[PDB]
Structure formats: structure tokens, C-alpha cells
């Protein structure tokens with residue numbers, strides 16, 4: 001859906017920006033600094049779930065740019081694995097949120113955060 | 127969820143960017159320049175539906191910035207109506223897409239596009 005590689009870069013950066021917001025805005029809740037409303041968190045994680053599927057289709061072949069490292073494309077199998085795993089960690093978070101289980105929420109949130117960092121260490125320019 | 131008004135501006139612009147992509151990428155399909163796969167379009171409109179609810183919460187009080195006109199905040203009732211209407215036009219599009227009805231899809235797509243322009247004429251800086 002992108003006329004030029006620039007448009008794919010713009011898309012993925014926007015998607016990752018929204019993900020970051022929908023993930024990070026839960027940080028105070030996980031830490032107990034803000035109250036836990038199970039229904040609020042369930043709805044937010046549903047949005048996160050939808051958003052977390054979007055960036056990967058905008059790293060199509062030839063869409064080098066931004067702060068993407070070229071290894072995303074020279075090591076495609078490995079990159080796919082990392083996004084697939086990340087999305088599996090999101091499923092765990094959805095399950096926690098759907099169950100209304102604050103302990104499972106905290107644990108799953110940490111695993112998601114680690115998955116974010118893991119990809120960035122391999123595939124995002126500093 | 128925004129530490130500073132700048133962060134709300136960044137959020138809404140990102141959300142509107144993704145909306146624009148998920149809406150505009152259907153243009154060739156509506157025109158018959160690209161094939162109509164009912165299931166593909168149903169899934170895309172589902173993403174559009176989720177995205178189309180997101181920008182409005184990032185125009186909270188005091189989040190002046192970007193290309194938002196100040197009338198968004200001096201005329202809050204009217205702005206709410208325009209986003210509510212826009213989202214109702216999205217419901218019509220979802221219904222078309224869920225029914226797999228290309229004629230209803232074309233018509234609803236045009237109405238959505240008109241709703242985009244209507245808000246921009248009133249509330250977005252040139």
C-alpha cells in the first residue's frame with residue numbers, strides 16, 4: 001500500500017509510536033502507582049493487540065530506511081521469528097488482561113517489554 | 127497518557143497517519159483498478175474501525191499544537207459531533223464490508239471520505 005519506501009517507513013514508525021503509547025501507558029498500573037480497573041486494561045490491551053500486528057507488513061523488501069538495520073532483510077527468517085515471538089507475548093498479555101489477573105498482567109508486561117528490547121538490540125539503529 | 131501536550135500531538139498525528147493508510151489503500155479496490163476480495167477488505171476495515179476511534183482522546187484540553195485549529199477546543203460540542211459522525215460513517219463501511227457488498231462499499235467509502243474533508247475544512251490548519 002506504499003507508493004515509495006518512504007511511505008512504508010512513515011507507516012511503521014507511526015504504528016510503533018502508537019504501540020509504544022498503548023504499552024507504556026500501563027506502566028503506572030503494573031507498578032501500583034495508578035489503580036487497576038480490569039475492564040479499562042482489557043480494552044486497552046485489545047487496542048494493543050490490533051496495533052502490534054501492524055508494523056511488520058511495512059518492512060517489505062526494499063523498504064530500507066529510518067532506523068531499521070539492514071539485517072532485517074538479510075536475516076528475514078530471524079526477523080520473522082522475533083516479531084512472531086513478540087506477538088505471542090502479546091497473546092499472553094491479552095490472556096492476563098481478559099482474566100483480570102493483576103499478577104499475570106505484571107509478569108506478561110515484563111515479558112513483552114523484554115521482547116521489545118530484544119528486537120531493538122538486533123534490528124534497530126542506535 | 128501524555129507527559130506533555132507534544133506527546134498528544136505526536137500520538138494523534140500517528141493515529142491519523144495510520145487511518146489514512148488503511149482508508150486510502152482501498153481506493154483502487156473501490157474503483158475496480160484492483161480486485162475485490164471480500165475477506166481482505168473485511169479484515170482491513172476492522173483495523174480501520176479500531177484506528178478510527180483513537181485520535182479523539184489525544185485532543186484533550188490544553189493539547190493545542192500541530193495543525194489543529196483552536197476551534198477544536200472553543201467549539202467542543204461541534205467537534206465531538208463531527209468525530210461521532212465520522213465514526214458512524216465508519217460503522218456503515220464496516221457493515222458494507224461485513225456483508226461483502228461492493229456497491230454498498232463504494233457508497234460508504236465516499237461518505238467516509240466526505241466526513242474526513244468536512245472535519246478538515248473546519249478544524250485543520252492549511
Ligand code: HEC
Nearest residue numbers: 013016017020023065066067068082083086116119123124
Ligand atoms: C522487532 C521485531 C521489533 C519489536 C518486537 C519491537 N520493535 Fe520497536 N522498532 C523496531 C524497529 C526496526 C524500529 C525502527 C523502525 C524504523 O524504520 O525507523 C523500531 C522503532 C520503534 C520506535 C520509534 C518509532 C519512530 O517514531 O520512529 C518506538 C517508539 C518503538 N519501536 C517502540 C517499541 C515498543 C514499545 C515495543 C514493544 C511493545 C517495540 N517497539 C517492539 C523493531 C521492533
Ligand code: HEC
Nearest residue numbers: 139142143146149191192193194208209212242245249250
Ligand atoms: C475531525 C473530526 C477529523 C476527522 C473526521 C478526520 N480528521 Fe484528519 N485531521 C484532523 C485534524 C484536526 C488534524 C490535525 C492534527 C494535528 O494535531 O496536527 C488532522 C490531520 C490528518 C492527517 C495528518 C497527520 C500528520 O501526519 O500530521 C492525516 C493524514 C489525516 N488527518 C487524514 C484523515 C483521513 C484520511 C480521515 C478520514 C478517514 C480523517 N483524517 C478524518 C481532523 C480530522
